[PDB]
């Protein structure tokens, strides 16, 4: 009853943290920028982890008996939240890049309306992908609970070929390679800006200060996505071993737990990274708690 205790502890924080982040945004209009529209998507997405994903994860750990639909949803629901975060993280990276690369067209292209539109699409795509095993790509009854109901065990009811090729390599690895690629251009060009402003016949500390702050946001964004791959790779890394190497010692249950748990942890690091990285955020939360 320790994995249960720890998982619960996480659930509370995930809820409190991101809910706080959502509230802070709702109160402080200085945080209601087009950029943070995606941050809320991250909040809602990661809140539901402690809300549902964690509850389900803890449940499916022991396994139960239910129909294929009901069993798949519970097993693949986590994929939706994890996939939605991908789009959010990617969008943010794009956003932070757009501003630095094209500050003038930033306001013309980055619209508070398009933000809401993209977010919606990301979620729709997240469900399609995250719940693709429900489209038929599953192992429900592949060579107890009785007819109709199936032993709901993640590894037994969810195809590995999907979790490796379609899910990881494509829906996770590729984006992370795109995101990382984006930040590459972000900082490379950002420092170029400073060099051009380094050879300017005028002070113009307004441009520098702004640029540095834009970079500070882009850097924070990088740290947010960085912690994502860092908390999910081990899990996929484990599965990559199990699949590509049937011979390779199948990951122990205890080690699998840790890797599984680490993924749930990511939802929590955000609220604290905002309070730490963003001086505007910390002061907002400080207000809420006190009052
Ligand atoms: C309930 C649950 C199950 C698993 C999980 N379990 N077994 C295998 N073989 N793969 C994954 C897995 C790996 C990468 C991405 C998503 C799931 C992970 C988490 C965090 N929660």
Tell me the CA end-to-end span of the chain in Å, nearest whole number: 36
**b/e 83-108 (16+ beta carbons within 10 angstroms → b):** bbbbbbbbbbbbbbbbbbeeeeebee
Contact 31, 107 (CB under 8 A): no
- Angstrom distance (rounded) from CA 90 to CA 175: 7
Resolution of the determined structure in angstroms stands at: 3.3
- Angstrom distance (rounded) from CA 264 to CA 55: 11
- Angstrom distance (rounded) from CA 190 to CA 185: 8
Task: Give the position, in ligand 1's atom list, of the atom nearest the Cα of 262.
Answer: 20
From the CA of 99, how far away is ligand 1's center (Å)?
A: 36
Return the residue whose CA atom lies nearest to atom 5 of ligand 1.
260
From the CA of 179, how far away is ligand 1's center (Å)?
A: 23
**b/e 178-206 (16+ beta carbons within 10 angstroms → b):** ebeebbeebeeebeebeeeeeeeeeeeee
- Angstrom distance (rounded) from CA 79 to CA 84: 8
Q: Which residues contact 126 (CB under 8 A, 6 or more apart)?
A: 80, 81, 83, 84, 86, 87
Going by C-alpha positions, the residue among 169, 181, 167 that lies closest to residue 83 is 167
From the CA of 82, how far away is ligand 1's center (Å)?
A: 11
Environment class of residue 143 by beta-carbon count within 10 Å: exposed (0-12), middle (13-18) or buried (19+)? exposed
- Angstrom distance (rounded) from CA 182 to CA 201: 31
Question: Cα dist. 201→3, 133, 138, 197, 223 in Å?
Answer: 62, 61, 65, 9, 35
- Angstrom distance (rounded) from CA 56 to CA 263: 14
CATH number corresponding to 1-291:
1.20.1070.10
Contact 134, 69 (CB under 8 A): yes
Q: Which residues contact 73 (CB under 8 A, 6 or more apart)?
A: 131, 134
Q: Which of 57, 263, 267 gets mutated to test ligand 1 (max ligand atoms within 8 A of its CB)?
A: 263
Give me the long-range contacts of 155-159 (CB less than 8 A, separation at least 24).
Answer: 157/68, 157/71, 157/72, 157/75, 158/72, 158/75, 158/76, 158/133, 159/133
Q: What are phi and psi of 49, to 5 degrees?
A: -60, -60
Q: What angle do CA 80, 117, 87 make, to 5 degrees?
A: 35
Enumerate residues lining ligand 1, CB below 6 A: 57, 60, 78, 154-155, 163, 235-236, 239, 260, 263
User: For 146, left (φ over 0), alpha (ψ -120 to 50), or beta?
Assistant: left
Q: What are phi and psi of 66, to 5 degrees?
A: -165, 170
- Angstrom distance (rounded) from CA 130 to CA 125: 8
From the CA of 235, how far away is ligand 1's center (Å)?
A: 7
With helix as H, strand as E and coil as C, how does the chain read?
Answer: CHHHHHHHHHHHHHHHHHHHHHHHHHHCCCCCCCCHHHHHHHHHHHHHHHHHHHHHHHHHHHCEEECHHHHHHHHHHHHHHHHHHHHHHHHHHHHHHHHHHCHHHHHHHCCHHHHHHHHHHHHHHHHHHHCHHHHCCCCCCCCCCCCCCEEECHHHHCCHHHHHHHHHHHHHHHHHHHHHHHHHHHHHHHHHHHHHHHHCCCCCHHHHHHHHHHHHHHHHHHHHHHHHHHHHHHHHHHHHHHHHCCCCCCCCHHHHHHHHHHHHHHHHHHHHHHHHHCHHHHHHHHHHHHC
Question: Cα dist. 185→57, 191, 192, 287 in Å?
Answer: 38, 10, 10, 37
């Amino acid at each position: 009853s320790v994995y249960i205790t720890v998982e619960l502890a996480i659930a509370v924080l995930a809820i409190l943290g991101n809910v706080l982040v959502c509230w802070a945004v709702w109160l402080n209009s200085n945080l209601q920028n087009v950029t943070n529209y995606f941050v809320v998507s991250l909040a809602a997405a990661d809140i539901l982890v402690g809300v549902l994903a964690i509850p389900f994860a803890i449940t499916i750990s022991t396994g139960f008996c239910a129909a294929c639909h009901g069993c798949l949803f519970i097993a693949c629901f986590v994929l939706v939240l994890a996939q939605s975060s991908i789009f959010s993280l990617l969008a943010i990276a794009i956003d932070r890049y757009i501003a630095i690369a094209i500050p003038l067209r930033y306001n013309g292209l980055v619209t508070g309306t398009r933000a809401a539109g993209i977010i919606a699409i990301c979620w729709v795509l997240s469900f399609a992908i995250g719940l693709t095993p429900m489209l038929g790509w599953n192992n429900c009854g592949q060579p107890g609970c009785g007819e109709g109901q199936v032993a709901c065990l993640f590894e037994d009811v969810v195809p590995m070929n999907y979790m490796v090729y379609f899910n990881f390599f494509a829906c996770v690895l590729v984006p992370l390679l795109l995101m990382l690629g984006v930040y590459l251009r972000i900082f490379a060009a950002a420092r170029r800006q400073l060099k051009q402003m380094e050879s300017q016949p005028l002070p113009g500390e307004r441009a520098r200060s702004t640029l540095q702050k834009e970079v500070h946001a882009a850097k924070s964004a990088a740290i947010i996505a960085g912690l994502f791959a860092l908390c999910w790779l081990p899990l996929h890394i484990i599965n990559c071993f199990t699949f590509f190497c049937p011979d390779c010692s199948h990951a122990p249950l205890w080690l699998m737990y840790l890797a599984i748990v680490l993924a749930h942890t990511n939802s929590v690091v955000n609220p604290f990274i905002y309070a730490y990285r963003i001086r505007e955020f910390r002061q907002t939360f400080r207000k809420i708690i006190r009052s």
